Amino acid sequence: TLRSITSPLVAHRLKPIRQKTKKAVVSILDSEEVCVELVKEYASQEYVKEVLQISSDGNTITIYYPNFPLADRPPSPTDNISRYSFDNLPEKYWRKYQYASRFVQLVRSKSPKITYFTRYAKCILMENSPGADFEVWFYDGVKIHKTEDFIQVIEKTGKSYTLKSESEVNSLKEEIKMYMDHANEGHRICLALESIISEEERKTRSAPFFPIIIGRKP
Amino acid sequence: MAFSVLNWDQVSRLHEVLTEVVPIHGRGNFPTLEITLKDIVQTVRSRLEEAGIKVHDVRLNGSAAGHVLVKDNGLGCKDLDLIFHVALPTEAEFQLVRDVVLCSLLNFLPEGVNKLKISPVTLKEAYVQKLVKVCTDTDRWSLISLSNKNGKNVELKFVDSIRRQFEFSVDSFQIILDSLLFFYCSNNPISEHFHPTVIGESMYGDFEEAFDHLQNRLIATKNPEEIRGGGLLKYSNLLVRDFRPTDQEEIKTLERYMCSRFFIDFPDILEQQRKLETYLQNHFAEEERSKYDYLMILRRVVNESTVCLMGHERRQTLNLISLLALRVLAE
């Protein structure tokens, strides 16, 4: 089953973006739908063979074949369109859909959801929920970045290094332990705020409650 | 829904629809096909049964059912929609349904009957104008269209499950054709003292209420929740054909829903322009006088029923309607 290999993408609250690559065009439109254009070359110009329009909850996938020359936006759909639902998508389209999934997924991990200003650092919880990335930009220059797997640290000097697991976590210079403690306080706070704000949104259906900035620089 | 029994008048007019020779344009060099509804229905059903897909029902939809039930009404005879109640589990069957329909296309030719090696792709690119495959949670059906021009567009739709195509009362009619396809096995033709029992249906509600709406030229709907974007455009078509709401009170609310829901589905004005230009070229291909009146009805509705907070987008669409009028106002 397709559901057993990736989750359906979610483009809610994501800024529009047109990313060209060698074999594909993927675009997050203003409507929050996600479009993937298949591009083929014919000498003096590049065309678009098929279009994969993905809903904002990526649940409904519309795929069409117009004949078109590449443009600033995806070609408009004609009559010959096929609509599938996530669980009825045939394997022939999976690899491309997983391409869009990996794009959206990466964009979410750099699209802020909650920004929170402390007395020492600017935290940024990203949108790639659950276990969203968490950047701590200390005012003095030190960088910290937390993923579900690795934990990157940068120092004022620009010394750049990374960490795995709890083997190294405890054993470190006590100056650096302070930054992670404050960052985990911030992380717990941001996850609590996300949960409560989401629940209130569930009750109060209207304009989004994210992105959200909290506090200010001294 | 509820059952009704087609009277003799209705069965006769149905017979005329089913035996009317319809021309199919041939995109490209391909000759014009002189087909018939009876013939297509028979051939398609026979070959579907041969390929192992049971066809439970065959029905006649569109404005054709309404023209059968009430002679020369206001709705126009341009539509000829058929529905084949067919189970569609895997994509294999969807592809078989495409092959079967294209094969049965090959069957109508003068001397090209022996040219039984034209391929399904050249036939699609010569005779098919619109193709729609849907296999989602609730919706599950396939649609093949035939050429749309000086005659009439024949649309074949194969429904496994459908989100209950509710619309206005006046186009929710389906006629179960099986009884009449069976009736011809008779050696003599259908006469007044000797007709089959044919059954009409209404896809939501009391059938006799819809029939009344159709005789008295009424505007009605029953579940606005499941209304989507193009409802407003259909509503304006009813207006340009002198149909009135069932009660002037509630239609001010229906209008707002149609207006609001229209903006939800078409926020970008370029898509709006395409949608409108193609609607106009579909429903008023040659009705020159009807086009301007339609555009001005639309403008009236948009102006009166668009909520205040969307005034900005309101002006843009009112302006689009106006610009379309100046063109229908020169040629």
UniProtKB/Swiss-Prot annotation, chain A:
Protein species of origin: Homo sapiens (Human)
Family membership: Belongs to the protein kinase superfamily. Ser/Thr protein kinase family. CDC5/Polo subfamily.
Intracellular or extracellular location(s): Cytoplasm, Cytoskeleton, Microtubule organizing center, Centrosome, Centriole; Nucleus, Nucleolus; Cleavage furrow; Cytoplasm, Cytoskeleton, Microtubule organizing center, Centrosome
Domain of life assignment: Eukaryota
Span of domain Cryptic POLO box 1 (CPB1): 1-110
Entry-annotated residues carrying Phosphoserine: S76
Domain Cryptic POLO box 2 (CPB2), chain residue ranges per copy: 111-218
Included stretch of the parent chain: 586 to 807 of 970
Induction per the UniProt record: Down-regulated in HCT 116 colorectal cancer cells, leading to aberrant centrioles composed of disorganized cylindrical microtubules and displaced appendages. Down-regulated by p53/TP53.
Gene: PLK4
Disulphide connectivity of cysteines: none
This protein's name: Serine/threonine-protein kinase PLK4
The protein's assembly and partners: Homodimer. Interacts with CEP152 (via N-terminus). Interacts with CEP78; this interaction may be important for proper PLK4 localization to the centriole and PLK4-induced overduplication of centrioles. Interacts with CEP131. Interacts simultaneously with TENT5C and CEP192. Interacts with TENT5C; this interaction leads to the TENT5C recruitment in the centrosome. Interacts with CEP85; this interaction may be important in cell migration and centriole assembly.
Domain writeup: Cryptic POLO box 1 (CPB1) and Cryptic POLO box 2 (CPB2) domains can simultaneously bind to both TENT5C and CEP192.
Free-text description of this protein's post-translational modifications in UniProt: Acetylation by KAT2A and KAT2B impairs kinase activity by shifting the kinase to an inactive conformation. Ubiquitinated; leading to its degradation by the proteasome. Deubiquitinated by USP54; leading to PLK4 stabilization.
UniProt disease annotation: Microcephaly and chorioretinopathy, autosomal recessive, 2: A severe disorder characterized by microcephaly, delayed psychomotor development, growth retardation with dwarfism, and ocular abnormalities.
Function (record text): Serine/threonine-protein kinase that plays a central role in centriole duplication. Able to trigger procentriole formation on the surface of the parental centriole cylinder, leading to the recruitment of centriole biogenesis proteins such as SASS6, CPAP, CCP110, CEP135 and gamma-tubulin. When overexpressed, it is able to induce centrosome amplification through the simultaneous generation of multiple procentrioles adjoining each parental centriole during S phase. Phosphorylates 'Ser-151' of FBXW5 during the G1/S transition, leading to inhibit FBXW5 ability to ubiquitinate SASS6.
From Swiss-Prot, chain B:
Gene Ontology MF annotations: poly(A) RNA polymerase activity; RNA binding
One Gene Ontology term from the biological process aspect of the record: mRNA stabilization
EC number annotated for this UniProt entry: 2.7.7.19
Keyword Nucleotide-binding annotated: no
Location(s), subcellular: Nucleus; Cytoplasm; Cytoplasm, Cytoskeleton, Microtubule organizing center, Centrosome
Recorded superkingdom: Eukaryota
Keywords: Cytoplasm, Cytoskeleton, Host-virus interaction, Nucleotidyltransferase, Nucleus, RNA-binding, Transferase
Induction statement: By type I interferons.
Enzyme class: transferase
Effect of E155Q: Does not affect colocalization with PLK4 in centrosome. Increases cell viability
Residues spanning the signal sequence: none
GO CC annotations, alphabetized: centrosome; cytoplasm; nucleoplasm; nucleus
Entry keyword annotation includes RNA-binding: yes
Reaction(s) catalysed (UniProt annotation): RNA(n) + ATP = RNA(n)-3'-adenine ribonucleotide + diphosphate
Family affiliation: Belongs to the TENT family.
Function: Catalyzes the transfer of one adenosine molecule from an ATP to an mRNA poly(A) tail bearing a 3'-OH terminal group and enhances mRNA stability and gene expression. Can also elongate RNA oligos ending with uridine molecule, provided that the sequence is adenosine-rich. Mainly targets mRNAs encoding endoplasmic reticulum-targeted protein. (Microbial infection) Seems to enhance replication of some viruses, including yellow fever virus, in response to type I interferon.
Subunit text: Interacts with BCCIP and PABPC1; the interaction has no effect on TENT5C poly(A) polymerase function. Interacts with PLK4; this interaction leads to the TENT5C recruitment into the centrosome.
Protein's UniProt name: Terminal nucleotidyltransferase 5C
Lineage of producing organism: Eukaryota, Metazoa, Chordata, Craniata, Vertebrata
Shown segment, full-protein numbering: 14 to 343 of 391
